[PDB]
Amino acid sequence: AHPLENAWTFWFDNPQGKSRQVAWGSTIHPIHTFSTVEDFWGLYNNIHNPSKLNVGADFHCFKNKIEPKWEDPICANGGKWTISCGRGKSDTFWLHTLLAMIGEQFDFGDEICGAVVSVRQKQERVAIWTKNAANEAAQISIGKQWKEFLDYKDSIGFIVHEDAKRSDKGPKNRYTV
């Protein structure tokens, strides 16, 4: 087969999902690792696209190399670039984002940790999680290149995970491109 540069892991948090796996203080989601192009498609072609997911569903795809210590947050010193789409309008962004990531297409790809698509009531958000938020050049490069990849015209923001411990009164974006 065609091996990928790194191994990646998919997991899905379906709200209405039946038989949710209960663990002490948590819900364990079905997780699947793949390290070849063939296995990526095997998973992608066997799951629904965002447009067919229900409100509250979240799909995640992260690089195994950056898996945190048990229950700890993923790439905690990083943050994420987010794009908000109307309902049923994130399928392309989701697919291209996955391909760009596993394909190691980003200039500062070493800082890319994963991507998550979140389906909500009136919006669907796709986000690329990165580490080392301090590396301004790297973060800005990733955001711009992602925006260019998807041909997205609107401005996108980067929110640092640690800043999540803050209040509500914005601004919230560390960077904007």
> How big is the CA angle at 125 (ends 124 and 126), to the nearest 5 degrees?
125
- Could you tell me if 162 and 108 are in contact, meaning their C-beta atoms sit under 8 angstroms apart? no
Burial 87-108 (b: 16+ CB within 10 A, else e): eeebbebbebbbebbbeeebeb
> What are the extents of the domains in the chain?
1-177
- Cis bond before residue 171 (omega within 30° of 0): yes
DSSP assignment of the chain equals --EEEEEEEEEEE-TT-SSPEEETTEEEPPEEEEEEHHHHHHHHTTS--GGGSPTT-EEEEEEGGGPPSTTPPTTTT-EEEEEEE-TT--HHHHHHHHHHHHTT-STTGGGEEEEEEEE-SS-EEEEEEES-TT-HHHHHHHHHHHHHHHT--S--EEEEGGGGGS-SSS---SEE-
**In 3D, which of 67, 164, 153 has the Cα closest to residue 114?**
67
Which amino acid would we find at residue 7? A
- Return d(Cα 79, Cα 162) in angstroms, integer: 8
Between CA 133 and CA 131 the distance in angstroms is 6
12 DSSP β-pair partners: 59
Q: How many CA atoms lie within 13 A of 28 on its CB side?
A: 7
By CB atoms closer than 10 A (0-12, 13-18, 19+), residue 115 is buried
Q: Which CATH number fits domain 1-177: 3.20.20.70, 3.90.470.20, 3.40.50.150, 3.30.760.10?
A: 3.30.760.10
Retrieve residue 95's tokens: 């697919």
Amino acid at 62: F
| Residue set of the binding site for mRNA | 20-25, 52, 70-71, 120-125, 165-169
Show binding-site residues.
Answer: 20-25, 52, 70-71, 120-125, 165-169
